[PDB]
């Protein structure tokens, strides 16, 4: 299944409205890491939005998590 940029519903506070855009992993490799993007640059990624939206913050990168499990001692099991 594939490469759809997803636009989430908007939410707002006392002064702004906000939204998240989800990129395919492939495309997020194109996002600059050292600076916020102009409209010119996020439009080159394929992001299409109406007037006046600003890339104001980099999202908190999520940790790379490894998952491990092991049998409990037998008398601890149910």
């Amino acid at each position: 299944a594939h490469k759809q940029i997803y636009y989430s519903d908007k939410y707002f506070d006392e002064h702004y409205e906000y939204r998240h855009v989800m990129l395919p992993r492939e495309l997020s490799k194109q996002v600059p890491k050292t600076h916020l993007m102009s409209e010119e640059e996020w439009r080159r990624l394929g992001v299409q939005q109406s007037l006046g939206w600003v890339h104001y913050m980099i999202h908190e990168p999520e940790p790379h998590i490894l998952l491990f499990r092991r049998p409990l001692p037998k008398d601890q099991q149910k």
Copy 2:
């Protein structure tokens, strides 16, 4: 600040105990993407755990999110 592998507290169900290990981003580039790891391979990453823990599941990769905001219309503001 730097490269500490983090071991979280354990939790359990009726049969197993579990834990998460957080890797520095650098090191997660070394984790295989096509298969689960033997103890030999996760020990080569620097993961140190006691006896019998098994890498049983790949964690759900988190979406790459872009954040945008724009001024509300003036009369919608507080």
Copy 3:
């Protein structure tokens, strides 16, 4: 089951105290979608808080996720 409101623990930064309130689905259907609520309106929903808490932001909407699973080929199972 039941239908109580859950009040989280307070936390703070340099300027504000913060808390989340969790509504049961039937009451969350009476929350305005187009504006922030005043103290008279969120008290009418039944939020019991002391003086001065401000409804300042709409929580970002969570996606509606479908989960899919399928068996691995035998030779990829462990």
Copy 4:
């Protein structure tokens, strides 16, 4: 139609492979509430993924959260 469905990347454990699909709010209204979807049901919805994928679980419904703040004294 024109609907943005987000397809997450796959992850797997010792026996299964898994994927999450993000639906727009409107198409969400059309998902059965009482039962899981058959392969013809999610293909009629517009989910375009390989055959064999099984709708196996209803996602955890996140609570409806109200956000409050109060200025500290100064």
Copy 5:
């Protein structure tokens, strides 16, 4: 504030019904750390549910996160 128990909405997979219950901190201090609870023990905590719900897993422990912020150099601000 207050101190009610919040009961989430039920969801299901091919075999089970599932729900989360959220405890206020004072009551969550009386939850066993070393074993799963029986129906007599979680009812004694005040969880009111119908017959047959099983406490089957301990929720994974969340890290204790400190948040740090510092001003960007002027020439990196926007």
Copy 6:
């Protein structure tokens, strides 16, 4: 001592740079509950990051969640 502190990667908005620090459960007990930490306070705790970083917020306390399941009828 020997304590695993996890340092998240940094992110920034238009005016600030941000970082999260993950503490082991035991060192967590030693964080002030009533006020934010000064730079000497978090340096005495073992947090080893550049000067200038300010402890600005107490993290959202996640609820204490009990997990229940019930078999469906068959």
